[PDB]
Design an enzyme around this catalytic site. Structure first.
Site, PDB file in Angstrom:
ATOM      1  N   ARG A  50     -13.669  54.207 -30.340  1.00  0.00           N
ATOM      2  CA  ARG A  50     -13.207  55.544 -29.988  1.00  0.00           C
ATOM      3  C   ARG A  50     -12.923  55.664 -28.502  1.00  0.00           C
ATOM      4  O   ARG A  50     -13.734  55.266 -27.663  1.00  0.00           O
ATOM      5  CB  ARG A  50     -14.250  56.582 -30.392  1.00  0.00           C
ATOM      6  CG  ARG A  50     -13.977  57.981 -29.878  1.00  0.00           C
ATOM      7  CD  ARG A  50     -15.008  58.957 -30.408  1.00  0.00           C
ATOM      8  NE  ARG A  50     -14.894  60.278 -29.794  1.00  0.00           N
ATOM      9  CZ  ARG A  50     -15.600  60.677 -28.741  1.00  0.00           C
ATOM     10  NH1 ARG A  50     -16.480  59.859 -28.188  1.00  0.00           N
ATOM     11  NH2 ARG A  50     -15.419  61.891 -28.233  1.00  0.00           N
TER      12      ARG A  50
ATOM     13  N   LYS B   7     -11.044  67.312 -36.472  1.00  0.00           N
ATOM     14  CA  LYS B   7     -12.402  67.536 -35.987  1.00  0.00           C
ATOM     15  C   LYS B   7     -12.804  68.997 -36.147  1.00  0.00           C
ATOM     16  O   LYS B   7     -12.153  69.879 -35.602  1.00  0.00           O
ATOM     17  CB  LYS B   7     -12.508  67.129 -34.518  1.00  0.00           C
ATOM     18  CG  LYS B   7     -12.355  65.630 -34.283  1.00  0.00           C
ATOM     19  CD  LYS B   7     -12.406  65.291 -32.801  1.00  0.00           C
ATOM     20  CE  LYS B   7     -13.674  65.836 -32.167  1.00  0.00           C
ATOM     21  NZ  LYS B   7     -13.734  65.615 -30.696  1.00  0.00           N
TER      22      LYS B   7
ATOM     23  N   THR C  50     -21.884  63.130 -32.930  1.00  0.00           N
ATOM     24  CA  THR C  50     -22.762  63.775 -31.953  1.00  0.00           C
ATOM     25  C   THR C  50     -24.211  63.846 -32.395  1.00  0.00           C
ATOM     26  O   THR C  50     -24.510  63.901 -33.588  1.00  0.00           O
ATOM     27  CB  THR C  50     -22.296  65.219 -31.574  1.00  0.00           C
ATOM     28  OG1 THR C  50     -22.740  66.152 -32.566  1.00  0.00           O
ATOM     29  CG2 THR C  50     -20.779  65.281 -31.468  1.00  0.00           C
TER      30      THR C  50
ATOM     31  N   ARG D 164     -11.541  78.191 -21.012  1.00  0.00           N
ATOM     32  CA  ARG D 164     -12.539  77.869 -19.999  1.00  0.00           C
ATOM     33  C   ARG D 164     -12.636  79.012 -18.989  1.00  0.00           C
ATOM     34  O   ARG D 164     -11.907  80.006 -19.077  1.00  0.00           O
ATOM     35  CB  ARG D 164     -12.146  76.560 -19.292  1.00  0.00           C
ATOM     36  CG  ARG D 164     -13.190  75.985 -18.331  1.00  0.00           C
ATOM     37  CD  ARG D 164     -14.210  75.088 -19.029  1.00  0.00           C
ATOM     38  NE  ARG D 164     -13.642  73.820 -19.482  1.00  0.00           N
ATOM     39  CZ  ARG D 164     -14.354  72.817 -19.988  1.00  0.00           C
ATOM     40  NH1 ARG D 164     -15.671  72.925 -20.107  1.00  0.00           N
ATOM     41  NH2 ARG D 164     -13.750  71.705 -20.382  1.00  0.00           N
TER      42      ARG D 164
END
Lengths: 587, 587, 587
Positions: C33, C221, C279, C74
């Site tokens: 990855r 994802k 994760t 953000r």
């Protein structure tokens, strides 16, 4: 819809002509039985000759079964005419030819006294008059008995000995001549009468082996207790079985036969070897156009029991309604068969089945044929193994066996649910597959969109285990492109290049065929079962809409709007992206 | 081992004596059928009287079934003697009494012409000679036909009309008198002949309701197409069914009856209502001591089909071997029953079963009875609902129904696998349970250590749904204490207080009974199937050893070494900690 | 025994060297990855280059996955350093760049105020500090909120908005450059970050379509509620899925994630599309040689849940024990996999599976592989469809996919239980079959006598549905003849021409090889598992004896006594009549 259980008919005066035979065949006769207990080689020779001519007059495959005469213990002459014997009488049987009288008769098996025990039971005249073995003067060789179910006893009547196991090694001098004659004649089957042990079967095998005619199937006929007791080794040695209910009732009590028949059939069923239910089928039909409730009931039940075939005797041999007997026999089969619990049978056969590759493929074929409700199970075959094996699983779908030898086809004429067809011998898997697909199409049993399960063993050019299976869609590939989604649908085509055509021609469930879709076509789209577009890519308006509405879409189909026309029945395969002719509910 | 399918016998000259009846009963007759199509109330009155006397001479429960005469269309007199009629003839039927001649006869249902259609088929003489409805002169009221299967036609023969639905509302004047007579007499059943619709059943119900005799079960007899077509409403209205194969074959083609019989039986089976298979059972036995292979086969199959009972007619009414017919009928049942696939049937009935509390308990009872292989399913019952319901699941274990009314017992005489017994009416669950346990013990069907499943509906003193089930061990509790572990074992007792006795008397698999064990007894212990000690606590030597060897142990059994003796068959229950008399493989 | 679940490793400073990579690969890394959220095209370009060099240093197939940066909201700069914000504070967010202060900060999604509702919740700094949407001054464009779980807020931290569905159509300018770069580079996969709807997936597809790189798989994802809510359309549009547990816990409450992970995996499982669990896998391993009980537990469970692959991030990217993380990840998989309930999974997948030809063959393959306990399922494949499909059924036997394109092999590097192999592209069924058999042999996974199930779709040279299956014995055919009986056996060969040799060399279970048997060999015969003879015919002494003892016998094997030697492990196939090298328990 096709009859599964095969029909075997005894040939005779009432059915020996070519025109008659042509009729029996068209009524559904699969096997022609020749009873060699009567008639001479010239007569059978002509009957055989006629079968073949009628077989050609029609395009039917009919196997030839030779029912031999076999061994049996008989009685000699009863002084000029016949004897009496009452509920008592001092009837002594001599192990030597003597003029039969109310006191001393004789048999044709001097080994009897050396087998029968005290208090035993001897029957004469096919079981009519029975006896009781009182004393056994082993010295003078005279089995002393007391007449039981007396009656009139004429010359040369049947001697039956139930309890004891009779030994008559080797085949008769007569059966031998018949067999060889059958070989010369090129028969397909041989029903061996009064099989008691595996060795009786081996003797015929040995003979066939010695005259290079091993191709000839051996059907063991069970007609007494020994044969019933030895059923396991007998089936293990023979190629099939014949359950003669009449003969059984001679040595075995009536109240016991029913379960015996059911047991003999199941055992054959489990080995995957053909079993014939014979005698007392539609006897009344020799005199009548229709059968009795009882007869229809007995036949129907032989079918529920699992018999591959049913047999007609006097009903077709000498009766007054030969072609009718076959016809009702046919109708009785079709009707009973609709009641068959196919899933259940499969489940039962899977259990009680030996763990083999052939059986694993057969079960897989049978289960798939059921779940997908296929139009047919096609089996290109070299010697017929695969078809017979699949038949054991008693499939709802027809079994189309494709042989490259007419004799192999006749061998399968006796097998449950198997309809044969011939084609050139193939040696590559793709050839066998193509030959299978071809047979299916010609069979007339499949329409575009239907499925067939093709199964066979590779090599393929050789006979052997069954180890390959393929599910094949019959329909033609009309066109292809980038399929969107994973589903498929069919419906009728609706060619519409513009929004205006879309809204005027689109009906509920239709398959929209266009160059491309856009926001203005939504109403028509929301009625579509699927969409075909000449244009677009994977993210065009037609594809996106298809994903969101959950309907199949095929994009990039070249002349879609000109090769498909209004009203055309097609199937759109989103996954894989292909269009097929007709309606295919499963892909 | 007990016969499941019940036997119904037609009473007559050959079986009307008390001694004869005493014999039929001992051979296994469960129901006595009275055919009211013949004889007068005085005769039946005496037969009934005799049944009851024979029923007492023996300790047998025999129900009384009254087969009524019912409606039917007949023909009048054929001029002095009889008519002819060939393959043609101009046979015209008049809706008015006329002297029957080769040209014009008459019927007894002037409503015929107002029901029969052109080209229809009329049969006379129980189906012998048939006709073809050519024209229908509705004016002069004369249905014109052309004789088909001609023959001789005498006076007053049967008129059958298959196709059309005949209407004959209300019960005959005759049937009515018979019914009332049956009520006075106190019969248990009434087989209504020629039931075509639910209304025919209601009429008899209404009558029974009007004479306060609702206790009387109504068995609907199917004898024609209408009755076959209306089977669902008929079963829904009647209490049971009678499949008359002979009558059916009159209006319905023989090749169709077999599946009809099977269908009628399954439908009754699914409703949990008794079904009787009648006519053409062992007919040949009127003249012979034994039946035909065919007859044994037909009967056996009616049993595999699911019939609760089989019926004898002339075989017991007038034949030469009444007691024999019942006997073979009995033997045929026992033999066929061994072949029943109990797990399968249960599985089939569970499916196709309505989601009810009664059915949930029945299935639970049936499954448990099978998994634990119980000796019996006992059902204390008020009106017989629970037993009938459990019978529907066709259990291998016998069903012991305990009634508190003899009439209820007779009602169950017809039900598959149900053997009744009487006891005082109970009103508390523990009483019903005790009564059930008592019945089981007296039944002679259970030995110590066996299990029985008791099921019934509480209240219990009232009839209703089945909602309670209990598994009960028959054996007596010999003693108790602190059981160690979770297992159980049985074997023979081996009393041994000292190591020396332990090593000299202990055998393999024995149940060691002692005050306490210690290291010196290990060899004997390692041979024990279980251990019983008077002493110790939960951590004594016997308990610890039992845990480590994985064998049951019961500690703290008071006089263990004196109340148990060498060779005594007992069961040691580690969990729960109890000792039982005999061998109980499941606890 | 081979690991089923694939291992995906994030490449970085700790694992970017060739020697390092050579190590990761040997430890079991299947996919490399590349996280494009950090680093520039030159760096990834070199990492990619190294993967390929390490891939060659070893003979390993490793796919390249490009994890994009994706959209996200953000915050801007917090005046020089960082802000505070306590359990209250008046924090107002401006839809315009403003110097962040304890009172007014700003975001980068001015469309926020036009999506967020009153009382809503906004999180900053990956979820650390959360807010409460008090008022929404739509006028001045300032969403008023009250600081909740306060803390320190530095520059440019993550802005998360759980409840509301954010709209960020099109791919970033950045992701676009990365994608194209990935195409130039020739990557195998693309993990699209923050997928919320099917359209995000389509955008990447469209782009790939526009640069002729459709070969590239798209892994969606899921990292927020929208993506979880839209999972059905997302999976329907993407080629695979990545479950990022960490990201989820940011917008979704921890107590809800566990079932979400399980639900996302099952959905991918049902579609037969690869799913990656990511994760918080072995995070502690960045500092330690071994993982925590918890981490091993979480990983093990992701496997029981059905994940095709597990992913390592910092553990291999920057941690101190890269090669160890992969190694434990490998060991954890092998151990958990032994606990898989293969029959059950198959049963579950069969149910909930769409009725298709491909699925019918897959289920048949999976069931057969289980019942016959085959050594392997081989799948020659054009684009990898068949292997992926069979993997969905989670077989115990390894899946050997034989591709004719290295890129296709890498595509399968991510799929559960699939080990690829390359071979020349074939176009005929017999070629595909041969290629499959060859692959199996080279694989090292089969020994003579083992079985393999070969499955693929014909044509075969084209990609498409799976519609053909074959069970194939690996062993070589040593010789053939007339097989007697229907069974098979193996054992060790015992060459014995004479009775004296037979009685001195024959051992229990041996396979007697001779010219012919006779009465004097019986003792040796009664110890044989099977018999092979050069002589005899179907009724010779060896055949007869074989039938009676129930052991396989093969007759007429030419030089049997010279081509087979003492101690040789062989299998005698009575039915079909063939001898095979080694022990084959199923034929």
């Amino acid at each position: 819809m096709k009859r599964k259980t095969k029909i075997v008919s005894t040939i005779g005066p009432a059915s020996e002509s070519v025109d008659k035979l042509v009729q029996l065949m068209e009524a559904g006769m699969n096997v022609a039985r020749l009873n060699f207990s009567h008639g001479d080689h010239e007569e059978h020779g002509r009957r055989i000759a006629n079968i073949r001519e009628a077989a050609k007059r029609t395009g039917r495959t009919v196997a030839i079964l030779l029912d031999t005469k076999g061994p049996e213990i008989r009685t000699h002459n009863m002084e000029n005419g016949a004897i009496e014997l009452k509920e008592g009488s001092k009837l002594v049987i001599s192990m030597s030819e003597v003029l039969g009288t109310p006191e001393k008769i004789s048999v044709t098996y001097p080994s009897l006294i050396d087998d029968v025990s005290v208090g035993a039971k001897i029957l004469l005249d096919d079981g009519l008059i029975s006896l009781e073995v009182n004393a056994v003067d082993k010295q003078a060789g005279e089995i002393v008995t007391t007449v039981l179910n007396g009656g009139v006893l004429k010359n040369k009547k049947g001697v039956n000995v139930p309890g004891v196991k009779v030994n008559l090694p080797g085949i008769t001098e007569k059966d031998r001549a018949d067999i060889l004659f059958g070989i010369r004649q090129g028969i397909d089957f041989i029903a061996a009468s009064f099989v008691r042990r595996a060795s009786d079967v081996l003797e015929i095998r040995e003979l066939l082996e010695a005259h290079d005619a091993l191709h000839i199937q051996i059907i063991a006929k069970i007609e007494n207790e020994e044969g019933v007791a030895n059923i396991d080794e007998i089936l293990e040695a023979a190629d099939g079985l014949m359950v003669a209910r009449g003969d059984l009732g001679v040595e075995i009590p009536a109240e016991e036969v029913p379960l015996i028949q059911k047991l003999l059939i199941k055992k054959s069923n489990m080995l995957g070897k053909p079993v014939i239910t014979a005698t007392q089928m539609l006897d009344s039909m020799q005199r009548n156009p229709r059968p009795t409730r009882a007869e229809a009931s007995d036949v129907a039940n032989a079918i529920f029991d699992g018999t591959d075939a049913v047999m007609l005797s006097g009903e077709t041999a000498a009766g007054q309604y030969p072609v009718e007997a076959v016809k009702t026999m046919h109708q009785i089969a079709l009707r009973t068969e609709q009641a068959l619990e196919h899933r259940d049978i499969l489940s039962q056969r899977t259990k009680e089945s030996q763990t083999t590759i052939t059986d694993a493929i057969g079960q897989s074929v049978a289960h798939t044929a059921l779940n997908l409700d296929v139009a047919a199970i096609v089996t290109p075959t070299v010697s017929g193994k695969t078809p017979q094996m699949v038949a054991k699983y008693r499939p709802k779908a027809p079994i189309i066996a494709v042989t490259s030898n007419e004799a192999v086809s006749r061998r399968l004429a006796l097998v449950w649910g198997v309809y044969t067809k011939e084609a050139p011998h193939v040696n590559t898997t793709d050839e066998m597959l193509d030959v299978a697909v071809d047979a299916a199409v010609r069979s007339g049993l499949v329409k575009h969109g239907d499925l067939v399960v093709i199964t066979a063993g590779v090599p393929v050019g050789e006979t052997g285990s069954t180890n390959l299976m393929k599910v094949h869609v019959i329909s033609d590939l009309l066109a292809k492109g980038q399929g969107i989604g994973r589903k498929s649908a069919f419906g009728k085509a609706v060619v519409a290049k513009t929004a205006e055509e879309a809204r005027q021609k689109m009906v509920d469930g239709g398959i929209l065929v266009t160059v491309s879709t856009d926001a203005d076509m939504m109403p028509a789209i929301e009625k579509a079962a699927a969409i075909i577009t000449e244009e677009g890519g994977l993210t065009s308006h037609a594809a996106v809409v298809g994903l969101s509405l959950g309907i199949p879409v095929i994009v990039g189909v070249e002349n879609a709007t000109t090769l498909f026309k209004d009203g055309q029945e097609i199937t759109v395969d989103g996954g894989f992206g292909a269009v097929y002719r007709g309606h295919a509910s499963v892909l």
